[PDB]
Design a protein around this nucleic acid. Structure first.
Ligand SMILES: OC[C@H]1O[C@@](CO)(O[C@H]2O[C@H](CO)[C@@H](O)[C@H](O)[C@H]2O)[C@@H](O)[C@@H]1O
Ligand SMILES: *Nc1ccc2c(c1)Cc1ccccc1-2
Length: 580
DNA sequence: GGGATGGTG
DNA sequence: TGCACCATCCCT
């Protein structure tokens, strides 16, 4: 039976109560400068639906929206805040965000709409957004009556579910995680996305022309070596030229056919000159398609800025993710791809890009959590951790660590952090099997605390059903007891890795909150632009660099207090690329 | 729509 | 490889 509500023509006083569930609907996935198709309000006085044109043009409503003393409960408040920012309207007083609450309670549920969240508490008096709006081409805003009842039902669910969700968070000891970390963070992310990052489009296009030339030359040399033309971008067609026409050996197979991964090509290079050209083609093409063309495609012509969206409720570990464009995977490893960063510039004249990153936060966190004496001491001496690990597992002095030894010790360190389960590890060839086990065994001898942690965390995941991070974030691991080898293994690696990666996420998130509070106290113009897991990127007047050199590192290093110190390096320059 | 590929921490 | 992600490209 339909849900009762007032389809208002104008804003009334009872619509501006001091507490309410609010829905400011933005249907476009990318909410930047997007339309708000409708508004719904549910409070002690009743349920209302308001048309955006009138609601957002109503001085009293706009003031209510900006009154921090007028509390609102919402779902994905960042989406509303940003869409409103593009309209010059400030949203304040959001005391509860159902999306963030659901995420903290169980990130595995993949909650991405009110219906999904409500279903967690056996509430189903609301439809999933996809059912209302459709998907892909079919997607569209329905007629007012249908739209209005949907937004009212979503608001009604929020109104009803706030208490139950808050009580469970309290039980889980996640109440402060929501109110003091994720929600305040939501506001900061909104400012970051709204501000955007300036792009030197001319530079990007010039690189594009050059890549097109080199690419043209390479693809031609390839057809020459292959004795025919074909779609090099097709792993299937390329696999036919390589493993059939040229007779190259099949070292790796895929659940489809011939594997042509870079690592596989790396091994085939000695057999024929075409391989290197394929690799070169792959490198240039990746840059052209994803980082030149793909990027230019999302730059706003009027401002030359890109406004990413930081999904704060997706990763299973508590990390953020970035989309359209993804600004968390801009090239840096290879010098040629690194050039791309020269296109990311300050949004104003005489401003500079400032980047600060934690040094080995995962291993420092691991040292803290595992309480390993050897590992904690290593960091207390601020030692090169990879060289130190090499010395221990290979039993040699610092002077005896060769480049390959350090490289191998580094791979071991990533392995420990990713989770050494009883069903992977090896690929990088060279004996593997018994020896890989011997090195890991050597490692656990040098770091007994880490061994204890790995065993304990797995046992704890099985006993409690989940693992937790420093700030009480959790991840349920039901497969921890699966009788399927492979499936159980994944869960074990997750139990070992999540507290590490997740705690690192907790720390940088608090640092962001602490940092913004400091920047405001200091009256600095500097502001956050991006977060890339263990680093923060900002821009500010050149006059502020010196203060930032002392302020940012300090704030980030002091976000939390661990058994080992936290270390943050920093760089700044005229472009993202120069901030090295 | 799925997999294959490759970009980041 | 093994942890956590996202975008482009084929191809059914
Ligand atoms: O607003 C981001 C927020 O919305 C969700 C759905 O509740 O994701 C939507 O928006 C993203 C940004 O455009 C898209 O990538 C995604 O496909 C779309 O469903 C949440 O996952 C997210 O936290
Ligand atoms: N995931 C992973 C696990 C173990 C090991 C590596 C990666 C590289 C390596 C080298 C030597 C011994 C053990 C491992």
């Amino acid at each position: 039976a339909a849900m009762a509500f007032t389809l208002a023509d104008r804003v009334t006083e009872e619509m501006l109560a001091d507490k309410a569930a609010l829905v400011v609907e933005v249907v476009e996935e990318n909410y930047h400068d997007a339309p708000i198709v409708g508004i719904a309000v549910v409070n002690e006085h009743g349920r209302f639906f308001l048309r955006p044109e009138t609601a957002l043009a109503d001085p009293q409503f706009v003031a209510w929206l900006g009154d921090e003393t007028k509390k609102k409960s919402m779902f994905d408040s960042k989406r509303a805040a940003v869409a409103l920012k593009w309209k010059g309207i400030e949203l304040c007083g959001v005391s509860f965000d159902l999306l963030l609450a659901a995420y903290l309670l169980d990130p595995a549920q993949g909650v991405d709409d009110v219906a999904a969240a409500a279903k967690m508490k056996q509430y189903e008096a609301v439809r999933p957004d996809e059912a209302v709006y459709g998907k892909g081409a079919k997607r569209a805003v329905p007629d007012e009556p249908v739209l209005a009842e949907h937004l009212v039902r979503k608001a009604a669910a929020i109104w009803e579910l706030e208490r139950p969700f808050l009580d469970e968070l309290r039980r889980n000891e996640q109440d402060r995680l929501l109110v003091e970390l994720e929600q305040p963070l939501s506001s900061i992310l909104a400012e970051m996305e709204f501000a955007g990052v300036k792009v030197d489009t001319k530079r990007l296009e010039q690189m594009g022309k050059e890549l097109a030339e080199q690419l043209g030359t390479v693809e031609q040399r390839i057809y020459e070596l292959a004795g025919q033309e074909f779609n090099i971008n097709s792993p299937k067609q390329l696999g036919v030229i390589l493993f059939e026409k040229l007779q190259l050996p099949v070292l790796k197979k895929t659940k489809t056919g011939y594997s042509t991964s870079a690592d596989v090509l790396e091994k085939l290079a000695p057999y024929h000159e075409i391989v290197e050209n394929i690799l070169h083609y792959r490198q240039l093409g990746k840059l052209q398609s994803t980082y030149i063309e793909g990027l230019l495609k999302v730059v706003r012509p009027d401002t030359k800025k890109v406004h990413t969206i930081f999904n704060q409720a997706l990763t299973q570990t508590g990390r953020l993710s970035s989309t359209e464009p993804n600004l968390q995977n801009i090239p840096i490893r290879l010098e040629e791809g690194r050039k791309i960063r020269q296109a990311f510039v300050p949004s104003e004249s005489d401003w500079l890009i400032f980047a600060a990153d934690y040094s080995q936060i995962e291993l420092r966190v691991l040292a803290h959590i595992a309480e390993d004496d050897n590992l904690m001491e290593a960091f207390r001496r601020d030692l090169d951790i990879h060289t130190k690990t090499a010395m221990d597992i290979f039993q040699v002095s610092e002077d005896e660590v060769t480049p390959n030894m350090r490289r191998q010790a580094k791979a071991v360190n990533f392995g420990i952090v990713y989770g050494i389960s009883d069903y992977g590890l090896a690929q990088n060839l060279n004996i593997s099997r018994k020896e890989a086990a011997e090195f890991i065994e050597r490692y656990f001898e040098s770091f007994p605390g880490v061994k204890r942690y790995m065993e304990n965390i797995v046992q704890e995941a099985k006993q409690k059903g989940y693992v937790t991070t420093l700030l009480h974030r959790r991840r349920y691991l039901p497969d921890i007891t699966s009788r399927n080898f492979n499936v159980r293994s994944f869960a074990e690696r997750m139990a070992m890795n999540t507290p590490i990666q997740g705690s690192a996420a907790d720390i940088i998130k608090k640092a962001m909150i602490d940092l913004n509070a400091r920047l405001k106290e200091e009256r600095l113009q500097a502001h956050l632009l991006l977060q890339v897991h263990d680093e923060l990127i900002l821009e500010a007047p050149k006059e502020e660099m010196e203060r930032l050199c002392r302020l940012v590192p300090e704030v980030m290093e002091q976000a939390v207090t661990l058994r080992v110190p936290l270390k943050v390096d920093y760089h700044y320059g005229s472009t993202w690329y120069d901030a090295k």
